[PDB]
């Protein structure tokens, strides 16, 4: 049949943007309850009734989640400019080799904002 | 003439059980969820009514399917003997397509942090 | 540059009434909603700045439009004589697109379970 | 014979305005909201039924008041000419206590970030 | 030590049915919910730790009780032969109180618009 | 005529706990989307139909909110141990003299936890 699954995670982190003007709130040390949705697309298995067990997606994500959660994002190599966009890219890059069916990463910095990457 | 997508959301409080998972797997025990399903349509907006079709008609069309689902054990429903999220999506789409030809997407959320989306593909 | 999609969501508290619904239909009465609107932009992420567009500029551009809608009677706004979600989506698009070229989607929710989405098409 | 407090929550989509606020206040303009109202009751838990009252008896009893409120202009309802959240809370209590003796609290939310609570005192 | 109230929330995905409702009533059908439980404690804030008790401790304490409830059929649990929100509040309390003396409230939500709240005998 | 009102705000902040044991996740630099509800109690005025104009509560709370939001909490005087409990107490100290109907301060560090203070 071919569908799209998703699983959402929340990590509690600090970050700050290095390249904004002096008076900019985004350049001050702050943090968020980030949410990340992991999307995968694939053919639904006839016998298991699913594309992939949600729990395998949780297990694959865990070490990446643990780097991010309760940490300062600017200290991870590659995230010295931890915009929502760069965080999407980085999460995509970490996951993609471990999860070929990855179709989309969505990060929500706040409750009223979102960014989405599809490897394009 | 403008083309747009609409959606309408429903919750149903159901029990289910997965028959093919390993013997200690938690999904294999009798359990339940507050399932959410969003029903999406696409079409052109009418210049007079100013809409594609009333949200209430989408509700009205889904009601019979929804009543099978809500406050019930999903495994007892013909066609849902393996009521995974994926299987629930295709099933609702099979049920709804003939009634609602502009149907473009069915979305099911087993929990607040997961979900399945089906476009009839 | 890698292509991505960003959204900012706003909420306005407004009254409205639908002029062209049948006699007896609830939407023909004066009522209102906590309307949510999400503004979506698409584009190439700049390698240096790490963004497509400063959200804060988006917030600033949208402000006077937001201020027309919030704590106001939608029907009194020119072009919103029939303030359906559909016509809200399109009205908002028409006001914003000249000022925000990367605008790719306007999404309006009149209720917590209903939704409309316009891409300009 | 345990003492507990139960609640049920309803949402009504309504318009209102405050008559008595200074000239250019935003609350003095015709606007509206998706109002959330929670009805709380207190009592002893019945050993036979395992509950204080059926969630759906409360719903059945509230339906007449809810329907006055929903998809309407609140200023036209007698006793709500000044439909602040406070006066709304009082009015709902006045309408409901006669018909639900175990009523303990009325909670009204104009928006997702505000709330008013009345305990009959 | 300033006196305060903390709470920790948990979601368990469970099946149940109510054995004592009239023959047609939906609650007597086998179904389920995403039950939310909130565990509250009260006490004095330590001048050094700056807290009453680490949130994670409340979670660690609840874990054996949570694991009985989650992904299970509640009716099969002893004490829960009538698993209403009320009985499930009293039951959670009875299990929790010996382990967490500062326990002050158990709050159970069968759905997103309903709730039950208990404070012991 | 006696009621309780609240108004809720979200501050996006960094913090770390200095007094947690050596391996504890909270001793690392991190952050949260903190939600604070500010409750007042009082008599509804028969003319205005309110206890207090929400616009005035918001104007009074605003610059205190501006200190918390998009900032490192440990740099605020009095917030050297910025737990949720200490957050509540700090907010109550700052606000109570300027809002005497203040009845309750409530902060939620995450979507699943919360702390409630009523000046006791
Ligand atoms: Zn940020
Ligand atoms: Zn399940
Ligand atoms: Zn409407
Ligand atoms: Zn209002
Ligand atoms: Zn139930
Ligand atoms: Zn923390």
Automatic annotation (TrEMBL), chains A, F:
Sorted UniProt keywords: Lyase, Metal-binding, Queuosine biosynthesis, Zinc
Classification via InterPro entries: 6-PTP_synth/QueD, 6-PTP_synth/QueD_sf
GO BP annotation list: tRNA queuosine(34) biosynthetic process
Active site, per annotation: 26, 70, 109
Cofactor note: Binds 1 zinc ion per subunit.
Known pathway: Purine metabolism; 7-cyano-7-deazaguanine biosynthesis
Protein name: 6-carboxy-5,6,7,8-tetrahydropterin synthase
Automatic annotation (TrEMBL), chains B, C, D, E:
Substrates-to-products reaction catalysed: 7,8-dihydroneopterin 3'-triphosphate + H2O = 6-carboxy-5,6,7,8-tetrahydropterin + triphosphate + acetaldehyde + 2 H(+)
Cofactor note: Binds 1 zinc ion per subunit.
Pathway: Purine metabolism; 7-cyano-7-deazaguanine biosynthesis
GO biological process: tRNA queuosine(34) biosynthetic process
Annotated transmembrane regions: none
Cofactor(s), by name: Zn(2+)
Record-linked InterPro entries: 6-PTP_synth/QueD (IPR007115), 6-PTP_synth/QueD_sf (IPR038418)
Primary enzyme class: lyase
Keywords for the protein's UniProt record, in alphabetical order: Lyase, Metal-binding, Queuosine biosynthesis, Zinc
Name listed for the protein in its UniProt record: 6-carboxy-5,6,7,8-tetrahydropterin synthase
